[PDB]
Design a binder for this molecule. Sequence first.
Ligand SMILES: */C(C)=C\C(=O)N1CCC[C@H]1c1nc(-c2ccc(C(=O)Nc3ccccn3)cc2)c2c(N)nccn12
Ligand SMILES: [Br-]
Ligand SMILES: [Br-]
Ligand SMILES: [Br-]
Ligand SMILES: [Br-]
Length: 271
Amino acid sequence: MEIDPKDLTFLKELGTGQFGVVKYGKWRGQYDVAIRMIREGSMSEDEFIEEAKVMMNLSHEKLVQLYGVCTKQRPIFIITEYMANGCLLNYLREMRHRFQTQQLLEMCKDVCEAMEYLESKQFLHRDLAARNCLVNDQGVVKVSDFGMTRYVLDDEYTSSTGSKFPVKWASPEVLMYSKFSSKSDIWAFGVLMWEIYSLGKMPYERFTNSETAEHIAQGLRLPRPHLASERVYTIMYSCWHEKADERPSFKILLSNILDVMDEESHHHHHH
Ligand SMILES: */C(C)=C\C(=O)N1CCC[C@H]1c1nc(-c2ccc(C(=O)Nc3ccccn3)cc2)c2c(N)nccn12
Ligand SMILES: [Br-]
Ligand SMILES: [Br-]
Ligand SMILES: [Br-]
Ligand SMILES: [Br-]
């Protein structure tokens, strides 16, 4: 897991993500990799380094693969699979010019498979959203940054009442009681489905975080995206049940997505 930084070559600046600068490079002169440089003073590094070992034991084809870390240095490096098509949000914005609606449901399936795996390992993502999903060269979507917000030092990001908290993806019990679970990830997954079918539109774009909380407390939810059929909207709406126990698991949700795929292929075969 501990990688020698001398085995890394930096070839292209990719930009800066939530958790620091990211660069494309080669590992051992053989493998394409993305190199995340954790921003100084942003993480509880001691706890993160211990949690990083648990994140390393996770492996699934729809999870962005982690190769290792460089911790005998400052800044810390995280070495990961390189996702050629970049962040899902930017990818969705570009899809507005050419796409087929079936592709959107396939994207939801990819993420749901990744979350079903994390669910089976009792591993919470805690900030599932399009901004944390990446797309490879084949258009496959993969989930990343699972569990990374646990040890963010800025309380404005981790506190349910913080100004930077992902309120617009948070379930009621997260906003009111800071109760995180796979069922809160389910809620966020529903919002992520809405993001995909809105082709990267921000949920509750014209809402303040305070107005969003009141909106959710009133039992109101996001509107049906124009590209989402009623059958598809039923799935993402099931993620938004007021009570966590009434939301489906990722295992059930994946089967529901596959079933709707069959219904969609017969959309014109009913009276
Ligand atoms: C948005 C989805 C991505 C994003 O904001 N950026 C900014 C730079 C270009 C792009 C990007 N980020 C990554 C990337 C790299 C590493 C990690 C990571 O360390 N994940 C992690 C650590 C621990 C536990 C779980 N996950 C996440 C994201 C990236 C990659 N890999 N390829 C291309 C572009 N890109
Ligand atoms: Br560079
Ligand atoms: Br088509
Ligand atoms: Br609760
Ligand atoms: Br809205």
